[PDB]
Amino acid sequence: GSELSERIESFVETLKRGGGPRSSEEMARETLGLLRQIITDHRWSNAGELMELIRREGRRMTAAQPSETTVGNMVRRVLKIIREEYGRLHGYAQLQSNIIEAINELLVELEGTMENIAAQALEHIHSNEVIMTIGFSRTVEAFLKEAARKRKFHVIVAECAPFCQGHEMAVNLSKAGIETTVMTDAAIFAVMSRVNKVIIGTKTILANGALRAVTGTHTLALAAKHHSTPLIVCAPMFKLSPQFPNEEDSFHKFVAPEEVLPFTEGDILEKVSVHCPVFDYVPPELITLFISNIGGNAPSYIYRLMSELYHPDDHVL
Amino acid sequence: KELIEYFKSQMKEDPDMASAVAAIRTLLEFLKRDKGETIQGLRANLTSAIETLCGVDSSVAVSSGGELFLRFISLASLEYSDYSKCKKIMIERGELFLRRISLSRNKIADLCHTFIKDGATILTHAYSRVVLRVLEAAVAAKKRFSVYVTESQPDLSGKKMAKALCHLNVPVTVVLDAAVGYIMEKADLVIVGAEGVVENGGIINKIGTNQMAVCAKAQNKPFYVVAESFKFVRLFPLNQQDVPDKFKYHPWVDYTAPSLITLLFTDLGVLTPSAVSDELIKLYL
Amino acid sequence: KELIEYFKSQMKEDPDMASAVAAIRTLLEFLKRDKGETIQGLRANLTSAIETLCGVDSSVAVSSGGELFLRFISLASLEYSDYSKCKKIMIERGELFLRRISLSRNKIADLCHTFIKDGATILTHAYSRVVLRVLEAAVAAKKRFSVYVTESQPDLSGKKMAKALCHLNVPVTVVLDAAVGYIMEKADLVIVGAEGVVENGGIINKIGTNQMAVCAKAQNKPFYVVAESFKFVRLFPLNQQDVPDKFKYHPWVDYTAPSLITLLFTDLGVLTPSAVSDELIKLYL
């Protein structure tokens, strides 16, 4: 009622204004908590009414921020869960406890994805290796910081030019002693002749195996395809989305251009056009392998996960 | 031969109708007019009807539709034990399958037309109703783009495609058959309708397609293919000569590898070229 | 205009004669019939004659031959101070240059035909006397090979090439204009005669060439180009649209990058595509 409305409005405003909260795992946990909180205090006779209600709230949540689709694909995952539960109960009153225990085991699966990636990380890192990483994410940082517990290798951290987020990852990896080397994003092809394999993360995996990620990794993947080095995307399953690339041109998230050109530049700021896209598009032909909590998958297999976690009816939400 | 006459009557009554759907309708009419209470006796008559349809029509689409109809008849024979109920069940299932297939062009139209941007430059091969349907669905959503159509030297249907598309009042330009590498730098995306999709993800199509896909790889343009579900065939051509000679006849056909193809568009969705292998081994020949 | 009439009389008297050599002969006849004792006054009349020849003939070969003849006249004017001896010196040097150019096809024939192996599969573009000369020199050395000739859809000269080559009694097959990616797997080497060679090593040629060179790169077949010394032009097209529009006229011309070309064959030798830049900057425009 009132508590539901103020929590939903606070969620919409904290997704509209900035990044609240910080990491994707805790916001996926609070999105699943919001979905279970909005299904325990409502009244419905048919499952289609709850389907349309979840569809309307998901439309509102993607209208809050279109580039942040983790809430959208988690709403879609809850929609496919209630769809398969209505299908297995149709072929009538015990459905709500089934959706509550399904959301509970989904939260158990979501709490142990990074430890599963760390458990399967041992078959992808050998001794005296060099590793390239762009941007910053806790998944690849935890990946490298536990893979260095038994292996000795090197990590090349290239910073990001809009927001220098590679610096905290470099000082977090250097506390574990992985011999990390900090460089810019400007000598990538100047260092790609020595990079053996590239371990990166992403923001959103698309339906065709493509991915949006932090900016500068499409160039890095082009260099990795030029030098034929394997590209390893360590991404969990809540970053998987059915949103196709050529869809209403709202792909990139454009942010304020002060990080690119500051306000103290002068009179030349009027006659210039400074853009700052924080995200970039990588096609699936430049990707070699995805690493999720269930294991490794080809970019020519992601559609099956699109058939195993989402429904083609709920693509428009 | 009443089957070839019924196929010609089903294909000639509607010029905007495909040949594989007329072959499936002819196979359903032959299964309705057979009335033979035998499992293998119906399968032999169905195989004879598919051979008679492939002897007349030299397309790969009618052969793939016959193979899918034979797999459907084998599934209906393996599902039901008794044949008397299985005949009516197969008739009703074939009617529902034809109803689902007849609405697939609307699925391609409302599913694929979102990829075309405004002010784009489409490159289009010879005449097919799938590309014309997705282009009229693109101009139905108030989109402006320049179309470059291949002249289709063996059968002048790209000129017929441009004559059908200029009545739609869109900017259409007939380009030369040897000029698909000349206009690849200005065409930001290319959509080529196929007539047969092999298991690995490549397409069996008209002779001018594959080299254009080579021009889609050296010039990194996204090669989009629109094809329905009845054009799936359980074949694997290794080279351009491993296609069967019954589909060749100066060849009329080629093969495009799945590495040169970006995306596929079927009624089951916008799908990676690796997914037709999933559907073909989930259908089990 | 007596210059266009003399050019038509020089080009129509011999069907096995190129257009650039007739343009060079017309320019030498105009320099002999000018008799103007002026340095810049002869250069302006020569530039007017080149503009009149390029207004009639839309080929790149006559423009490159005119540019090389203007550079030769500038070299003859910069070598000798007085003009009275320089006119006769330029006339004798042009006669010796035409004598050296007239024997260049024999140089291509005896220099390039050693690359064709026995039992090979040659792929050949539209009609040019250089490829016909090197093929008759190849069959003069008792070699057997299968020839696949492009039909050349704008001007049916590949059919004329096959009609000229079947009188030579060689196995010649007319392939479709949209089938150069179909027969690339069976053609182990491809020889395409060009009509204009730009500075970096690419070639300006007929519209069906460049995509075939793309098929020469994805299928790693060696793309061989035969072209004489008068087809060198000091131009740099960046894309397919950076060629001048006076050589375009449905385009009739394209551009092939030097990365897709394996070797060049000129009377100065069998040479890397980087060597035409050496000759063009040693000639100094």
CSV table of C-alpha atoms in Angstrom, one decimal, chain C residues 27 30 34 39-51:
chain,number,residue,atom,x,y,z
C,27,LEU,CA,49.7,13.5,-79.3
C,30,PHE,CA,49.8,16.9,-82.8
C,34,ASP,CA,51.9,22.2,-84.1
C,39,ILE,CA,57.7,26.3,-74.3
C,40,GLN,CA,54.4,27.1,-72.5
C,41,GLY,CA,52.7,27.6,-75.9
C,42,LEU,CA,53.3,24.0,-76.8
C,43,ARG,CA,52.3,22.8,-73.3
C,44,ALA,CA,49.0,24.6,-73.4
C,45,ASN,CA,48.2,23.1,-76.8
C,46,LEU,CA,49.2,19.7,-75.5
C,47,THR,CA,47.0,20.1,-72.5
C,48,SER,CA,44.1,21.1,-74.8
C,49,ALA,CA,44.8,18.0,-76.9
C,50,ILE,CA,44.7,15.8,-73.8
C,51,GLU,CA,41.5,17.5,-72.7
